């Protein structure tokens, strides 16, 4: 078990390398085919039947998310037959390209693909592995880019933040609260992509870091919202300020660095005179903070820490590269004169 637990973990990133390093439609077929075969035993380890009744819902979704891709691949074999990763030379194929590929980056359609998976998994350790599946198909879209029907890609993005802004008003499961708002940032970096595909990854990098800090701060004891009442006066009061340092940043306020892509997202989006569409998104992003307020009101205000059981013992977790993470996640908004020069 502990030898191959690295080996299974090793081949996941081996999959997404082959997605990035190829000029061939059949290798990128294989690429996130073997990824979908490498995620399954991570879901299992304690062999609980709820984990099995979550992975199989995860399974046959991504099976079709594989198998629909190849149906697009044989069309531009019948249409000019070249296999370089380029324009698809058929709008009937590019339609079949994107809205199959959008399953693995789950949009406003394919609703319960995200929450029903992430809720019900006992492994709340991670399950940060669902950032890799946010990383691999974005590394195809940078190359599909100059042949899209241009209306389908923006329609899924306007709907993306519309449902994600609504989902967590009806929630206590902080996994589902973090399952939602993963639709939110995946609407923005699609909505840039017709206008300068560079600086899309700027939204991608900031989203990785502010989700990496979130579950590592959730790996103290908390899995339920009212369980985040009983740690300030029980586990550690130092965690209570630090969790307020991130939930307010990821809402996007300008003195923190969570606002930083949405600062730059308009400088690109206008100057190409699309005005009514960024205004509808930024006003929707107001609702992205009322998840966090009404959640930060619970942990930072000492809301009745009952159940007398005092932790006089020390803590030994594995906070691996943890304390160096919210130093570019708060105070980096002055520290990006050109993030669009090293990445772009």
């Amino acid at each position: 078990n502990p030898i191959i637990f690295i080996i299974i973990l090793l081949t996941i990133m081996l999959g997404t390398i082959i997605v990035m390093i190829s000029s061939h439609w059949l290798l990128v077929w294989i690429g996130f085919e073997m990824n979908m075969l490498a995620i399954i035993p991570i879901m299992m380890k304690n062999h609980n039947p709820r984990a099995t009744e979550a992975s199989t819902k995860y399974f046959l979704t991504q099976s079709t998310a594989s198998m629909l891709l190849m149906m697009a691949v044989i069309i531009n074999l019948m249409f000019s037959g070249q296999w370089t990763v380029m324009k698809l030379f058929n709008p009937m194929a590019s339609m079949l390209m994107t809205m199959a590929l959008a399953m693995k980056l789950g949009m406003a359609p394919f609703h319960f693909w995200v929450p029903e998976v992430t809720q019900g998994i006992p492994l709340s350790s991670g399950l940060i592995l669902l950032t890799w599946q946010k990383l691999a198909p974005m590394s195809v879209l940078y190359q599909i880019f100059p042949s899209i029907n241009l209306n389908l890609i923006l329609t899924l993005s306007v709907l993306s933040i519309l449902i994600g802004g609504w989902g967590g008003l009806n929630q206590t499961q902080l996994r589902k609260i973090m399952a939602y708002s993963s639709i939110a940032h995946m609407g923005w970096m699609t909505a840039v992509l017709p206008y300068n595909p560079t600086m899309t990854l700027l939204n991608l990098i900031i989203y990785i870091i502010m989700t990496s800090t979130m579950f590592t701060m959730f790996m103290a004891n908390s899995t339920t919202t009212t369980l985040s009442l009983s740690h300030t006066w029980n586990k550690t009061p130092i965690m209570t300020v630090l969790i307020l340092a991130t939930l307010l940043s990821m809402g996007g306020l300008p003195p923190l660095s969570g606002f930083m892509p949405k600062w730059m997202i308009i400088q690109e989006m206008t100057k190409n005179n699309s005005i009514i569409l960024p205004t509808f998104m930024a006003i929707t992003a107001l609702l992205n903070l009322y998840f966090y307020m009404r959640l930060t009101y619970s942990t930072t205000l000492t809301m009745f820490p009952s159940t007398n059981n005092m932790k006089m013992k020390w803590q030994f977790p594995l906070m691996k590269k943890m304390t160096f993470l919210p130093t570019m996640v708060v105070l980096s908004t002055m520290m990006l004169p050109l993030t669009p020069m090293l990445s772009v």
């Binding site: 979908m36 399954i40 979550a54 199989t56 046959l60 589902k176």
Partner: protein
Amino acid sequence: SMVYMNIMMAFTVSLVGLLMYRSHLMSSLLCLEGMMLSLFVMAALTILNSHFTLASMMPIILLVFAACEAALGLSLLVMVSNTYGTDYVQNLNLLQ
């Protein structure tokens, strides 16, 4: 030609309401491997007549992963029936 039109309707046995529904859940996974050979042949039409001679490995290496993907999800339905005895996709407890 008409040999491309059929088979192209034969690809539309991947009807999604008959791909995860209803119960006797093996009938769902049935047409998944049944969605294979609608792509093994349809590729092998155009590769063969237009004498490519190099992409012959492509439908062969297709069927390598086609059973290998089909090998995985069949195992989990045993693990469904390990604690239950029947598949019955109307089984639902873990909600969203």
